[PDB]
Write a protein that binds this ligand. Structure first.
Ligand SMILES: Nc1ncnc2c1ncn2[C@@H]1O[C@H](COP(=O)(O)OP(=O)(O)O)[C@@H](O)[C@H]1O
Ligand SMILES: Nc1ncnc2c1ncn2[C@@H]1O[C@H](COP(=O)(O)OP(=O)(O)O)[C@@H](O)[C@H]1O
Ligand SMILES: Nc1ncnc2c1ncn2[C@@H]1O[C@H](COP(=O)(O)OP(=O)(O)O)[C@@H](O)[C@H]1O
Ligand SMILES: [Mg+2]
Ligand SMILES: [Mg+2]
Ligand SMILES: [Mg+2]
Lengths: 7, 371, 371, 371, 7
């Protein structure tokens, strides 16, 4: 969730 | 009775009865287990899903590939793949039909031993053979003189085979394969902030590779275009609905087959290993190989890889040669098809090791026929 | 003129001039905003607060960290942080000194580009660089051969850099970090009766985490020690002065560093990512890497972590090999110590990108010597 | 002033002043370039490394041999080997001492010019000579007649030297040598599941070849013993501490010297090329030769190789010719030793091409000799 | 890692 997709 | 043909590929298991023109069973070679405690006991869960089951239930499972670079790393996982191959995917009692096993070149003696032991003693197959995958690849095009460049999820290999006899001393293996290109695809997608870490996420990246990557013909000019216009870049949407843009990365991933330095592998690229195997072949025969470079296995499916292999190996060959890259459709499952072809034949009907032979002579029969 | 070294950590920013052995300023990297209407017009209050001002006003602000997992999730709250870093905490004009920033491995390429634009076009710096956090550390350790496990509030990195020549392909980034363990500490403290919810309570949990918690040398045995005895019970007073008695919780909270399965991440423990990072490197250098394993960043400060690390990699690694977890006191700021050294190491004086270069090559200049 | 003696071997460069009975410098003839980026700029890192520096730095370098099979492949790389020899390995200015270069028989005539031109014009040698390697070997063995079987890393050379002269018509250059032998070890290791690919990894294999491998006096008898009992099995652990377990492989590798078929080589085996050389001689000197079989160069060191060579070549010769194998210790260095003796002769001290002779005649000095 | 001493 910090990254774009993914986390 | 019809013999059973099984292509033990590192990423996908292709299998069927002898004489089928295409495999019946085609499934990812995955064994799964649950990542979390089960709480709705009335569901009646099962402890390890396999194949398309594991791929259906993806995000609640850890996903194990039991085969790494042709080496069977986990045997009880692989034994479950074969159990599912036989009783469920093909629906057959493997103790009542002969069995044809594919195997990768330059793969250790113990792998064949344990394959043999499991077939002859877990599954009690009545007769069996283990074929060098490239033999089957060449046979699948109906030709009987050439060099095969096989490139699966786990192994890339070059095998010269002349009048149907292999050249064993002239074989090459390069472990840079489809999984490794999936690995590098992760890393480069991370540049645009698209992180992928879980095995489940790995499978997403595999899917992405399989539909937006392509072999650039001309890397320098391409990458100069990619730094000049957004027109080369496009998009895909996750099982989570959100869109992801694949760009410079599209070509950068598959470029690695020609430049293994990009994954920090000093090993030569696929054009260099093909050349370097042709140049291991006797000076007479090199012409006969250049008209007969056959590609096989699923990572040979990248668009333009034939064009690139040609335009590259062109430079490695002398001028005045018919450098022709044999890249047909069905190269996807070619290895298996070749198995089915060869399995149908009375000459090959001499080759199959009888269970009784192995039973009496122990591993000493296979210790020969592996060469 | 003296350059400035600033580490943009996900939890706390460390900054100062070059040459010094400790970073003068430590504003915990937090921006915070009034949770309610301001009523006393005579107080002279302000829109939002930062660092220790945010900590001072904590019980009436919603707190946001504008860096997560190293990604700068919000650019205006990061730029507020830099405005306070320079003009309030350090009382220096960044448009009169070169500046060195720090950044995580594998962070999205866009982050470096935005940072650069904010430095060159908000703060008008003369020249700039962005060192890869791990790298700086080995400088801080002196040793130019080693593998750095850096673990802070956000990221965790395990770079191996050898003979001073890196090995980028072997880098592994695990997004388990100090924030993640703060968040897990909330869950386990609930089991004995204590509720923590607000952003402000997250900092109280952080205080409990920085004082009473420690790493078990063997989880099962120490677990059993609780189950048998009160001997590991200790207590902490909240701001109310009420004491909260926590136990079985200390050696559980950080056991997550070795078992991320406790927190529903998939990837292996920091010991396993350490061993697996070494195993990516070419087989010669491994002997030297095992003898030069370096810890850095605030989450490496748990008591017992070295003992556990050393035994854990001693299980994974070979027998007839020596394992040296080089973990000094002051491991915490062993980055704005390495950056101090790097800006002092006058051979580096060509590396600072000049504003004139950035004003010609645009954001593309930042990809000079990074991963 | 004393002369300098240099042995331009394929694998290791043996060098030192004349009269000495052991060389003062012995190092692997490797130019090793970076595999990766030198991020820690404070190292003072080198554009390339050589000899023991490259072998220490093995894990981060691409190791290139400048001599392959027996010919120089890249002159500037060889030139670096020479530069390093003088200034670093011996710590001398090459302008200041006479110099001897070893050379192989039937090396094409242009090579002599390139070597000569480099030694006078790059290295300013005050006098120079170039010598047939094999002659030096017998010379060192004292005897004034015999057949040499010299084998290093690149070429196996057989020469019958008679009345102190090489007989050129009888010289059997064989392209099988240490390096080629190294490759085959890689394969037979692969059978048992050990892998090695990088050019760094090649040098690890070289270390194994020089330790565990040996020559069995009769192949299938030994192999039958080894197939019966694990008593013939030994081990040696890599830099990464894991032991390798090895039996059957130990005699199997150097068997190839007697069986070039194992590698698909069309050329005859080591005893064979020796006989095949003997038979070409002036018939009267046949018995003069058979009592005078002389072995040399690093590949000649394997235990049991002399006893095998005797039982082997005894078959080829008509019996009662009294074939005897000269193979004491120190035969690792006979070639360089010979030059050290030759360079001690006062007559030879007259016979060198002087610097003044080359400075008047240029490379044309060789055209009287080369035909 | 597959390989017994290599991958
Ligand atoms: N359209 C495609 N483009 C590129 N690669 C593909 C494509 N389809 C499949 N692949 C690759 O083929 C590999 C597996 O091919 P296959 O040989 O059938 O299995 P295995 O390699 O296990 O024998 C996978 O790693 C996958 O990445
Ligand atoms: N004594 C301690 N033991 C364990 N963890 C600690 C201790 N002190 C601080 N920490 C953790 O370290 C985190 C900060 O990491 P640090 O390396 O100092 O900065 P960054 O997170 O920017 O790398 C804090 O969130 C805190 O939870
Ligand atoms: N004790 C040994 N056992 C096995 N091989 C050896 C031994 N000593 C040397 N060699 C081999 O000899 C080769 C080089 O022989 P040498 O003649 O010394 O080098 P060059 O021909 O380059 O001068 C090396 O590749 C090495 O593997
Ligand atoms: Mg396959
Ligand atoms: Mg940090
Ligand atoms: Mg030699």
């Amino acid at each position: 969730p910090a990254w774009x997709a993914x986390c | 009775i019809a013999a059973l043909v099984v292509d033990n590929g590192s990423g996908m298991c292709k299998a069927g009865f002898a004489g089928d023109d295409a495999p019946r069973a085609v499934f990812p070679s995955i064994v799964g287990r649950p990542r979390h405690q089960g709480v709705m006991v009335g569901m009646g869960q099962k402890d390890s899903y396999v194949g398309d089951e594991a791929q259906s239930k993806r995000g609640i499972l850890t996903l194990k590939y039991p085969i790494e670079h042709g080496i069977v790393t986990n045997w009880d996982d692989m034994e479950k793949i074969w159990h599912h191959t036989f009783y469920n995917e093909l629906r057959v009692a493997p103790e009542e039909h002969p069995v044809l096993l594919t195997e990768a070149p330059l793969n250790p003696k113990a792998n064949r031993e344990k394959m043999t032991q499991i077939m002859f003693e877990t599954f009690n197959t009545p007769a069996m053979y283990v074929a060098i995958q490239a033999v089957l690849s060449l046979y699948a095009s109906g030709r009987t003189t050439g060099i095969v460049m096989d490139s699966g999820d786990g192994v890339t290999h070059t095998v010269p085979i002349y009048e149907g006899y292999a050249l064993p001393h002239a074989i090459l293996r390069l472990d840079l394969a489809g999984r490794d290109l999936t690995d590098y695809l992760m890393k480069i997608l991370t540049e645009r902030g698209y992180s992928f870490t879980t095995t489940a996420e790995r499978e997403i990246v595999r899917d992405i590779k399989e539909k937006l990557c392509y072999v650039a013909l001309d890397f320098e000019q391409e990458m100069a275009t990619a730094a000049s216009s957004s027109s080369l870049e496009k998009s895909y949407e996750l099982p989570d609905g959100q869109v992801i843009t694949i760009g410079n990365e599209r070509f950068r991933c598959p470029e690695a087959l020609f430049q293994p330095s990009f994954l920090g592998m000093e090993s030569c690229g696929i054009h260099e290993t093909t050349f370097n195997s042709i140049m291991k072949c006797d000076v007479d025969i090199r012409k006969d190989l250049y008209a007969n470079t056959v590609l096989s296995g699923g990572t040979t499916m990248y668009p333009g890889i034939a064009d690139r292999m040609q335009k590259e190996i062109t430079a490695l060959a002398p001028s005045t040669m018919k450098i022709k890259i044999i890249a047909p459709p069905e190269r996807k499952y070619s290895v298996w098809i070749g198995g089915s072809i060869l399995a149908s034949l009375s000459t090959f009907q001499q080759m199959w090791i009888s269970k009784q032979e192995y039973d009496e002579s122990g591993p000493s029969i296979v210790h020969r026929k592996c060469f």
